[PDB]
Amino acid sequence: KATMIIEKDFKIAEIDKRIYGSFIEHLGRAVYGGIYEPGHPQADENGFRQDVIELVKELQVPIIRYPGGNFVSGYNWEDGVGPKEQRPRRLDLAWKSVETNEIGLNEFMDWAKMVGAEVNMAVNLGTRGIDAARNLVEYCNHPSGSYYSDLRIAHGYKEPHKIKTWCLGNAMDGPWQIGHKTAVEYGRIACEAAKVMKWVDPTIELVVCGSSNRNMPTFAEWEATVLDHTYDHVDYISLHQYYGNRDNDTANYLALSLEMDDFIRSVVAIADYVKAKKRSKKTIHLSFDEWNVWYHSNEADKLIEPWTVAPPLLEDIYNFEDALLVGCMLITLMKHADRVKIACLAQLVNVIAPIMTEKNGPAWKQTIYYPFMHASVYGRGVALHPVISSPKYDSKDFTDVPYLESIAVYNEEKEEVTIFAVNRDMEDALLLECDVRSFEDYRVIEHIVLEHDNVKQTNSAQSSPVVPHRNGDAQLSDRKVSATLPKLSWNVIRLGK
Amino acid sequence: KATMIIEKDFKIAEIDKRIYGSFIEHLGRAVYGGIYEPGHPQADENGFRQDVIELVKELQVPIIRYPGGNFVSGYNWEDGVGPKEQRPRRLDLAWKSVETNEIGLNEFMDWAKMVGAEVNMAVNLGTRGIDAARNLVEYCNHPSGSYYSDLRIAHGYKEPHKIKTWCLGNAMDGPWQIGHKTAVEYGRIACEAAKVMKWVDPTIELVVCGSSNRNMPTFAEWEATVLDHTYDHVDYISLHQYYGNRDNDTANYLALSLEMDDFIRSVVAIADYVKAKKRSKKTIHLSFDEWNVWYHSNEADKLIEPWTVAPPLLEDIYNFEDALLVGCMLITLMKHADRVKIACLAQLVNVIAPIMTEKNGPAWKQTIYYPFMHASVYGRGVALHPVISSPKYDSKDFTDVPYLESIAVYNEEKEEVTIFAVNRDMEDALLLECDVRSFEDYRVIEHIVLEHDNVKQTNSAQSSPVVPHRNGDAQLSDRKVSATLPKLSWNVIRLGK
Amino acid sequence: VGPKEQRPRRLDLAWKSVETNEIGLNEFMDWAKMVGAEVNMAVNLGTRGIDAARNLVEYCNHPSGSYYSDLRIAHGYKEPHKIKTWCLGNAMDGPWQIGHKTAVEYGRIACEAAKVMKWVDPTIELVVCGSSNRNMPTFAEWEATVLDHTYDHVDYISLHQYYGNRD
Ligand SMILES: OC[C@@H]1O[C@@H](O[C@@H]2[C@@H](O)[C@H](O)OC[C@H]2O)[C@H](O)[C@H]1O
Ligand SMILES: OC[C@@H]1O[C@@H](O[C@@H]2[C@@H](O)[C@H](O)OC[C@H]2O)[C@H](O)[C@H]1O
């Protein structure tokens, strides 16, 4: 048994829809063979796969980070604009590929328009600096009457792209990064880049890079230093996290979102420390701008020869327990709606992705597609503070792991309450009782369930055994929703009226 | 109208009773003419004033910090132990007084025993260091069979004092402090002191010094650095805050608890930053080990000539509005019961104190005595999360100040729920409605109110116009408490059965 | 040192034992004489510093006619011990050490200690503390910093190593 109070008046915050964002890098087949494949039967007049367009629309992704990631730290934006014949072929040192630049930022903006997403554009602070930063904001956002704005117009884009949210480089705390910088070096260049960007266009907002990973030797120290240098000029600090089940321990693997919770809380604390140090009235929020499961493709990638065009890198094939963890991660983002305002599932197409494609072939939905779609589609509104009493377990790395991972989201305009819930229990069903007295006249609309008896079962182009059904048994009786959550399941219990 | 949900299952934390602590320094008349006055008709066999003993006992103060405060940073503990004829007269540079050491630590422990309080003992890290720190812990806490333990026995104290909680110096960040240290210097000496003290007696807890106030140029930076140096060896970090109404603005004055709230949240954040930086599983809590109103006596103090014995320093005479602010401060400590585990009203007797005395004459209760008493006596149990909908106002330094400052404390053992509540509204009553559906069979025991028409009214030895009455109108019907909180009122609504 | 009745019992924080001081340095010198060994004497640079270092060298090595030398004589040891080789503390890089010092803090105090000890008796040699072991996070960095601080005033740098067959 587990219980949960769903009190209308105990609220965390309005969920910023941008926590359902994603990310496309010039990495493997994310662009070339992902969003863009001339000649494909479903390619439109600009070469974009219509099938991929539809799959992304169904996810209702509001914002997509672009073009990197490790790639941006060695990239020249000018290489990807203007007539194709003058675009150079480059050695991308991030992924050891030859980048033709056949797609650059203006074509990416064209694609983003088709899926209804704004773009969170990243500037190179690896090999480049403040002058390229201002020039790109000018190129994208300044109407006309300057060299760079008129250049965009000359390239065929009369109206400025009017990009709101920019990343100040990619995480360069990492020794694997092109133009790695210490926290002071990065802090200083990000501060000066931030200023010139906002002088070109004061309507923008800026994301400073947090650590590439919670396990970095410089974790926390990095964020504190970087914010000390940039606080007044920036709006968000980013965090990144990937998980994997490398020792085949499901119970420990599904507990990993408790760590994500600790990580978010830690970075919020650093933001508030620096706020107090500066005596600033401005609160800095979080952009969780890379998160996912990533591990299945590690061995296969080691066999790819360098200097090919669009190699099949990072092509994890996700299984059902992966979807459960993705589920737990989304609930964790919602739980921190008060301070996490942007998040990006890394990445959107082919590369550790909910959507996979075959060349001259179909596009299909990975297991992780479903909880993400459900969260994005039904998780708009106010995140409510959960009061839960759940049974618990210990695993290798965690203690008092609740079997139940859950939160309710209240959408007053729709008069709906959505309960997202994972039952981590590998053996037993969990009898959830939700107290819903504060929601008068609400009825159960539906109870969606994603479950599969084999946690290692994947989907594929040829069949999808791992798909949601609507046979959940949630029911209202005397101001209480009782629902059975099957063992190892993701549940969406929708209420309304 | 304001509303409030009082749900048993929406809890902040068990309140640590040590948030109702206080503090006695060798400062002015706190000791000499305060707790201790051999000539007094009401002095006991050891010179302790019995009237003061009774006044402290009624506060139920569980812990008292001693002997400083600025005094400790120049103090040699050995000067205050052993036969009185061998105790030296010293120039106390902190308060420019001659300290006779007629009272030292053993006599203080005797006094604390009488009032039922444990002692939070401070070690000198101004002119002294790690050797004096271990020796003092040995003298106080080691049973026997070493030079210092046998010395305590020889001084007349067979059983060890077994002092639990120790301060690593006094706030050393101040340029006015004896033996001021930078955050690095202090962090290092506090770390090395903490280690040897814990090796003498591993049962102890240690408090590291935070900033002397939120306005210090080194605020926040101090706490981060100090904790980076000491995290693994200490248990709490301290904060200090004093307030004053120097510009006669009551509305702004009563809002100041909002700032206290932010100050606490800032120091919690720093603790959690450093925790993450160290990858530690230990959480550090806060000791709010100096807090009060302090300003009334600033001008009188300037005229005191140096090198007297027991000068009348820091003798604020408190008024009614000071009591309201103290009440708001107390509610703010309770609302941070999850992370503030010790707090000390600075100070207990004569010195910015709830109890005042006259030589050979009476002891009396300042205005601030009452809210402190009510919080201490009725505020043991679990602090509940307030969901308050209250009207609000703007003042000079604050926006959206709730007229209602309030929290409930639920004591399961006594089966009581107590609602502490200040109405800051300077002109109008506030009709409070509380949803206590979660508390079956409860009734209103009483509704205590502290109010006076004149915010500047003081108490005195001869008359006390400012005293609580029990004619509040709180009533519980159909699972709802409705009470009228008069304008500018401190309220204690007690429920039971 | 001195009459046994005036020697205090101390809590030795290093090994959590009560040290009676029934044996101190003069009795140790007596024992070392019996086994034919010279003594490599260590000074405390944890809770103590440069004043205690010069005074100990004076007590042990200065012949007579100063407070500390005449004190050794009065304690029953007319001829000076004439200790040749001294340790400037024990390895202070360890977080388990009483009065742990960073490499800079230790380098500075060892330098100033070495100077006064040599001014009392220029015939001595000094050993500066290296790392407590090769696996310390500060290994090598420690030795470079310490020697940068002390090079001109010292003669040796120490190393420590223990081994075990735990697997
Ligand atoms: O989303 C794909 C990439 O993830 C980030 O890369 C890091 C990876 O290369 C490193 O080896 O481990 C930690 C990862 O964070 C990078 O931002 C992006 O290009
Ligand atoms: O409780 C009395 C004293 O308050 C603290 O002293 C500081 C004061 O002297 C300074 O001038 O203003 C701020 C105060 O924090 C001190 O800890 C104690 O002795």
Swiss-Prot record, chain C:
Q: What is this protein called?
A: Intracellular exo-alpha-(1->5)-L-arabinofuranosidase
Record-stated family: Belongs to the glycosyl hydrolase 51 family.
Cite the active-site annotation: 91 (proton donor/acceptor)
Q: Where is it localised? A: Cytoplasm
Quaternary structure and interacting proteins, as annotated: Homohexamer; trimer of dimers.
Q: Where does alpha-L-arabinofuranose bind?
A: 90, 162
- Natural source organism: Geobacillus stearothermophilus
The induction comment states: Transcription is repressed by glucose and by the binding of AraR to the operon promoter. L-arabinose acts as an inducer by inhibiting the binding of AraR to the DNA, thus allowing expression of the gene.
Cited function: Involved in the degradation of arabinan and is a key enzyme in the complete degradation of the plant cell wall. Catalyzes the cleavage of terminal alpha-(1->5)-arabinofuranosyl bonds in different hemicellulosic homopolysaccharides (branched and debranched arabinans). It acts preferentially on aryl-alpha-L-arabinofuranosides, and is much less effective on aryl-beta-D-xylopyranosides.
